[PDB]
Design a protein around this ligand. Structure first.
Ligand SMILES: *[C@@H]1O[C@H](CO)[C@@H](O)[C@H](O)[C@H]1NC(C)=O
Lengths: 124, 194, 117
């Protein structure tokens, strides 16, 4: 039971790199999704999340308008679209996952199962 | 015809401790949670046993509102069917829990320069507390190894422990204001709807 | 057990409400209460004061409650010693909750008063 991450590289301003992440476990039904971004061991800041049922989508204010998330059931590969590259985007990206299902919004680091590796993009 | 006093609970000047929580009932009003559910002003909006959207088209006869302040990492004990020190000795949520748990950071008010020591919690008792039951007592519990039988000395401790806040504390030690609003249904007509 | 100084000493007159005082280090959320012993004995309870500033425990000898002071800024703990019991002369130390869990230790000093009339 671990985490698998794909995607990443180096892209300058005005580019794109999808940041996908998949769960090989069978508990995808009752596990929510969350995202965090911090390269130098900084405190993890909320990026985006999806509710358990899937009608409501919640995002951080900064990433609103560019970042977009989606839910997958064929391979349980939750997708995030990253665009509008900036200098501060050069950071380690974490694929956080919520615990057992609960109707609501989680925007804190109180509980999370696994911490991913992720990739960072360097802009010249 | 008047809105429910949910804002009064949200904007209380002071908050009760975990062992002295205040229950304020809600009745004879209608609550419109649409403006606040999407306001994103709450960092935790868990709703066990009911969807947040579905409860709008439903009427609840009785509403129980509880308020207490605990640590950022101490909210695990507040969950249905969960065993923990806070659940056993301070505040226990029953398995048949249909309320919505709302919590948010309180660094602006609860945490301040100089430290705060007003809050308390209990850790010593004979058995676990019954859910939705609160007991306040000054009896000094004594360990079975060495009974003082009249004083608080060796193997004899007062149940209450002082509890502290300060800005220099980490994120895990940060205060969090926790409000739980429970809803139930009965054969009597409901005075609270959505 | 680094630096917890106290004060005391007096044999002027007994029968009144002469007070005793000491000081403690940075305690924060720590419970403090002085203890005294007896000749050929030890570990006799006196009082216990919480860190809230409002929680107070009293001895069976003292009737109900008496005057106790505690300054959070100065970090000082005071005791109620009213009625100046003629046989209640001993060594007083401002021991913390060494028996309890979330208080490290304090057993490092002691003060005495021998007022008589
Ligand atoms: C809570 O009440 C006080 C006193 O009227 C007011 O100043 C404050 O703005 C209220 N809280 C919010 C979030 O408006």
């Amino acid at each position: 039971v671990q985490l698998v991450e794909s995607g990443g590289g180096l892209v300058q301003a005005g580019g794109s790199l999808r940041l996908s992440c998949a769960v090989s476990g069978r508990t995808f039904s009752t596990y929510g999704m969350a995202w965090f971004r911090q390269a130098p061991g900084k405190e993890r800041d909320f990026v985006a999340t999806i509710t358990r049922s899937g009608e409501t989508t919640l995002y951080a204010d900064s990433v609103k308008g560019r970042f977009t998330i989606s839910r997958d059931n064929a391979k349980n590969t939750v997708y995030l679209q990253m665009n509008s590259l900036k200098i501060e985007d050069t950071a380690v990206y974490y694929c956080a996952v919520r615990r057992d299902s609960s109707w609501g919004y989680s925007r804190d680091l109180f509980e999370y199962d696994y911490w991913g590796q992720g990739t960072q993009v360097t802009v010249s | 015809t008047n809105l429910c006093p949910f804002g009064e609970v949200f904007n209380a000047t002071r908050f009760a401790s975990v062992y002295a929580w205040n229950r304020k009932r809600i009745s004879n009003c209608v609550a419109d949670y649409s403006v606040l559910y999407n306001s994103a002003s709450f960092s935790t909006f868990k709703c066990y046993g009911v969807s947040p959207t579905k409860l709008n088209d439903l009427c609840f006869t009785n509403v129980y509102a509880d308020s207490f302040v605990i640590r950022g990492d101490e909210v695990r004990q507040i969950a249905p069917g969960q065993t923990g020190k806070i659940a056993d000795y301070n505040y226990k949520l029953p398995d048949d829990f249909t309320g919505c748990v709302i919590a948010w950071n309180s660094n602006n008010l609860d945490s301040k320069v100089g430290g705060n020591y007003n809050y308390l919690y209990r850790l010593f008792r004979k058995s676990n507390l019954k859910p939705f039951e609160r007991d306040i007592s000054t009896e000094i519990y004594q360990a079975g190894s060495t009974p003082c039988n009249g004083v608080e000395g060796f193997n004899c401790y007062f149940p209450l422990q002082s509890y502290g806040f300060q800005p220099t504390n980490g994120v895990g030690y940060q205060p969090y204001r926790v409000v739980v609003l429970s809803f139930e249904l009965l054969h009597a007509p409901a005075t609270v709807c959505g | 057990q680094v630096q917890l100084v106290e004060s005391g000493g007096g044999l002027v007159q007994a029968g009144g409400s002469l007070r005793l005082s000491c000081a403690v280090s940075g305690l924060g959320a720590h419970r403090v209460g002085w203890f005294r012993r007896a000749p050929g004995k030890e570990r006799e309870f006196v009082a216990a004061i919480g860190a809230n500033g409002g929680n107070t425990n009293y001895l069976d000898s003292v009737k109900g409650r008496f005057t106790i002071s505690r300054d959070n800024a100065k970090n000082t703990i005071y005791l109620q010693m009213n009625s100046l019991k003629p046989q209640d002369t001993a060594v007083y130390y401002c021991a913390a909750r060494d028996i309890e869990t979330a208080e490290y230790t304090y057993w490092g000093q002691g003060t005495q008063v021998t007022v008589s009339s």
